[PDB]
Amino acid sequence: SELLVNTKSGKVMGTRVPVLSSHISAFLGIPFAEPPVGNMRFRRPEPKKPWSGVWNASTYPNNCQQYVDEQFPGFSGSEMWNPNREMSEDCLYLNIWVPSPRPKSTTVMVWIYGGGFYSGSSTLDVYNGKYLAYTEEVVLVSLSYRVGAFGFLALHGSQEAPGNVGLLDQRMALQWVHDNIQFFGGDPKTVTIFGESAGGASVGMHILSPGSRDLFRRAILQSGSPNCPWASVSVAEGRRRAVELGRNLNCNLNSDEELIHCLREKKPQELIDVEWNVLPFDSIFRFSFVPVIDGEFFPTSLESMLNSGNFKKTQILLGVNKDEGSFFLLYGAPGFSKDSESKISREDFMSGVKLSVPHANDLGLDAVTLQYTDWMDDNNGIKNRDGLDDIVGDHNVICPLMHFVNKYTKFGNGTYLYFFNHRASNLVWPEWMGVIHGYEIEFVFGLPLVKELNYTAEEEALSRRIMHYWATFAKTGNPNEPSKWPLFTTKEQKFIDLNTEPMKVHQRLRVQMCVFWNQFLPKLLNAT
């Protein structure tokens, strides 16, 4: 049947789904690994053992155990990111949307959710893959992976909790696509992995990791890169946090086995409740359990790998949004509120930069401050707000990504950069937040194409050209079909704006600030 597919691990029965007055095939909750429960917690994923009979792939799977945001109960702005189904450690599944009739050897796109490595689900409404698969006629896959301690507790040396298992889960899902996508009409030789935030950082890390390189063809990174300051920690820092987690839960800390056995006896919510207690400083845009530079998944430091060109050489398409920092300021910085313009006093501004650059010394903080303060009008609350907004976005997303784009381009086979700066007309967040981190996703997934969501006609057209840029890129390595999106080159360094107005080409995206963040500040903190 069109809905009955035999994979290498067993049979799966999909379901016919409606989409824009038509239909496509959907296979939800297909297991790609053995449930990482009990003694398998913190351990590398194990391939899913074959099963007899037909697997019911008609409904979404459980979401992985994670911290749940309850800042604004009932508010769709924050809740659209929360797990929309039962949470469970048995959460390693993937979803597939296939156009009907089933194509032959068509392009495949694999989505990797973000969420700072401490959260995220493959089942969110905004990640619904039916519109993109249909409109662009590609086989769209969305995977899952352990987040939080469950996926990144790192005790280098141990094989029970080596760290990076969340990334290894992602790899096993890609390995599964490599071996079974052909049975759903997909071409395993033309797979594009794409993700946002932590998902973008993940895509980037797979580009770097030798063990992942052969599992995909091209990549798309949205508002995230492997070198982001929050995306990874050293084995030493990973160990300290892991040990501090045990301490918080009164664990025997005599050895790794004792520490691990203790942590494995605790219930999921017990770990999550103290998850944030292991951070070394008071800060924002910083997460407890993230990937570790182990010398295994990551041969050597990310920078040395980027300078030597030790990574997959292919085509990449990446970009950022206009206001990457607002979301995190709102949750952890004084003076910010969801129900006000949020004019930031000078005192709160100071507090904010400290929170934004926890690792910096006083001289470093003075540098950031001077770099972002207009001394002809320092008591302007709006400028202090926008300034803090830029500080968080530039340091955590934009500049780290530009550093990545410039390094990759020297060895890559084609780079396409974008600057998404369109403010959705039906946004539920306040205006001061601007073009928020993660809100280009709804456009990438074609949400504007559904009338009921009340988007403007201009936004629908915008979403359509964005999906076509992504799809066309996925299948050829060029977002343009034979206004052309120019190729980012080391010399001209061009990029385009992504909004409802006719395309505009620019050069050197926020080069001034990024010179500060990528060269001066690092040098300053190293010398002092």
Next chain:
Amino acid sequence: SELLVNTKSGKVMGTRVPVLSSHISAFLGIPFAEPPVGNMRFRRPEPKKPWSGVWNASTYPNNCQQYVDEQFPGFSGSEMWNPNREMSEDCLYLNIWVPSPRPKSTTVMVWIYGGGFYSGSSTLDVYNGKYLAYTEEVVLVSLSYRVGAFGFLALHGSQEAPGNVGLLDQRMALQWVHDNIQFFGGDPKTVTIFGESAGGASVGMHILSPGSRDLFRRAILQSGSPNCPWASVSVAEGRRRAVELGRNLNCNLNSDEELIHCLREKKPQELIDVEWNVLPFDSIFRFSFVPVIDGEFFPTSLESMLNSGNFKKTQILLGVNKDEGSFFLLYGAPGFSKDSESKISREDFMSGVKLSVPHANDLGLDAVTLQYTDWMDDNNGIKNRDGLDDIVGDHNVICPLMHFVNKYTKFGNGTYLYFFNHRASNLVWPEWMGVIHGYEIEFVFGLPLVKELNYTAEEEALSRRIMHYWATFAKTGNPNEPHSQESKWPLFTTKEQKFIDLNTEPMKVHQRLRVQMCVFWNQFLPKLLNAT
């Protein structure tokens, strides 16, 4: 007889000089100290001892021994600053212009020339005081002082070459004005001291030094302040340079006595020839022999003195010109030329910053570079040229002056700040140099009032209001004339920090003169350089 005056040191005979269809009395070349020659070299000045008969004061005196600029032979733009009289170690004299008929007890203004403490003359044509004294009816005095090694060689400890003697020469001329100016019609209780560049730093130094404070009423500083990076050195650096001068002349360096004795046997031109070799690094806007923080003329560090209010509290009027650094870039920075647009390559831009901030470590250099570089267009020759111009101007003159003004105002009794940004219609220097360091002086001294000089009608008016501002300030401590119709020059307050532009257009009030860059130079950079 207007021209015949008897001072505490003897009689003097002035001369009647014409001025704008009228006339005034001029007393030129009056001695105020003993010739600091022979064994006097490097030593503190000594009061001129009484003389008999009438001293002929109808001609300008000699200029002090100094380096002479021969970069552009025949070029007026540079030569107008060179000595226009014979040089000699016997140069401690002063000139005086007195309105005619002789006033009874009027306002006095004393001019202190600049020149980096290594040059300068009281006799230059641009300092001719007849126009100002005549138009504003004030008694105008022009003093002189030893420059270069002769006036600032410092070997702390010794009493033969203690340092700051050039500053002491200035003080002695002030002591003379205090004791004798009343005989020329001026009020010794109402003396304003004003100077440009090094002259400006000097005025600021007298405001600070306890030994100078009671010798004047108010002060005007033009493009210069005591805290400028080039205006002084530590006793240690002073000794280093002093010893380095001897080494450059095969002098016996076994002791101060022998070192000094050796340097005193040398001809003037001999010291001058190697003057520049004693500098720490290759640089621009840096001079070999300047005032030293000795603990005597200067009780403690200039900064601690400014923070504690340890200085004369009165009214001050100061400011800067739009393009303070162009003059120095032209002379010592690669890529600059008098006969070209001077578009600076990135390579030369880098070299210039190294030159402009010679005391900075690699980190400090990157900081400066980043602060003045538009990374969206880094190869723009013009932006690179102007960027260097701003770097040199902000670091050496503007920001140090803003630091001074903000600290002084916390204790002062009245601050007036200006921003001179008028490019004279008859400038001989190239367009890229803009409003040059020192070119506000011609307006201050009324040169625009003489037709043959070809200044525009609007420049004459500008000169007249500037002279009136200076004089009125000298007389009352406020450049504004009460209940007058003209726009008012507002006071500079720690809170509003107001200042006016000084040009041919109607007055404009602004606030926080170059705060952005000055916060960088006065707060951030020092912290960075202090780190390690």
